[PDB]
């Protein structure tokens, strides 16, 4: 996260840190708890991931230093990537992780509500991007979960900012015209959380951008409301 501040413990209890174990253990991506055995994240996070056996999901974490060999985690039973996904820049950048065991909800780990189909017309004015990503283009993963308040940008304005790309309605953009606050390397897969009528909604999945926090380059997020039926298809099967 560029231009953000340290989160307080329990502030974003749906936020997870997804780690890879191969060749050595390191943070891979962010993700969001959406159900008691379900993490919603970005499909591009799994580039080169040949098996869910190398993945570890840690919830209720503020600081990466809380993670040691004796730290409890959730194993991943299945990686479900949208089957229209080709690359982040072309959309469908969405994936589900089916966990091997269930998350016991509490004040440190609980789900974020998905947006409602009726909320496609609502204007969100209180949106935040979170993660342990870089604070600048060439940096390192942060110990403390960072947060940054970012305004949503219309599809029309986002398309003007990304000449040469096709910004679809399955994408949602967020950023200041002058830049300065955005997601960066290591934040992808994490949430864009918007508070509406005192309830937090998972509006976006951190996906891609041209650099980080540049003037007139908003962050591009998977527009979660456009995938509610896909999520229910995969999580409510049989």
């Amino acid at each position: 996260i560029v231009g953000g501040t340290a989160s307080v413990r329990g502030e974003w209890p749906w936020q997870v840190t997804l780690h890879t174990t191969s060749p050595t253990q390191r943070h891979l991506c962010g993700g969001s708890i959406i159900g008691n055995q379900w993490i919603l994240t970005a499909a591009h996070c799994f580039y080169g991931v040949e098996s869910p056996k190398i993945l570890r999901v840690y919830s209720g974490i503020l600081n990466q230093s809380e993670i040691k060999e004796d730290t409890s985690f959730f194993g991943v039973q299945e990686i479900i990537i949208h089957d229209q996904y080709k690359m982040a820049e072309s959309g469908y950048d969405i994936a589900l992780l089916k966990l091997e065991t269930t998350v016991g909800y509490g004040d440190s780990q609980r789900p974020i509500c998905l947006p409602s189909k009726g909320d496609r017309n609502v204007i969100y004015t209180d949106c935040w991007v979170t993660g342990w990503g870089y604070r600048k283009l060439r940096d390192k993963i942060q110990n403390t979960l960072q947060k940054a308040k970012i305004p949503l940008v219309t599809n029309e304005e986002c398309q003007k900012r990304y000449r040469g790309h096709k910004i679809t309605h399955k994408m949602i953009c967020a950023g200041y015209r002058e830049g300065g606050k955005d997601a960066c390397k290591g934040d992808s897969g994490g949430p864009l959380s918007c508070k509406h009528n005192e309830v937090w909604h998972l509006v976006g999945i951190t996906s891609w951008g041209e650099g980080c926090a540049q003037r007139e380059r908003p962050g591009v997020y998977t527009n979660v409301v456009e995938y509610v039926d896909w999520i229910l298809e995969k999580t409510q099967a049989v």
Binding site: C113, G118, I231, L232
Partner: peptide, 7 residues
Amino acid sequence: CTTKIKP
């Protein structure tokens, strides 16, 4: 939480 995800 209008949208419901079954356990």
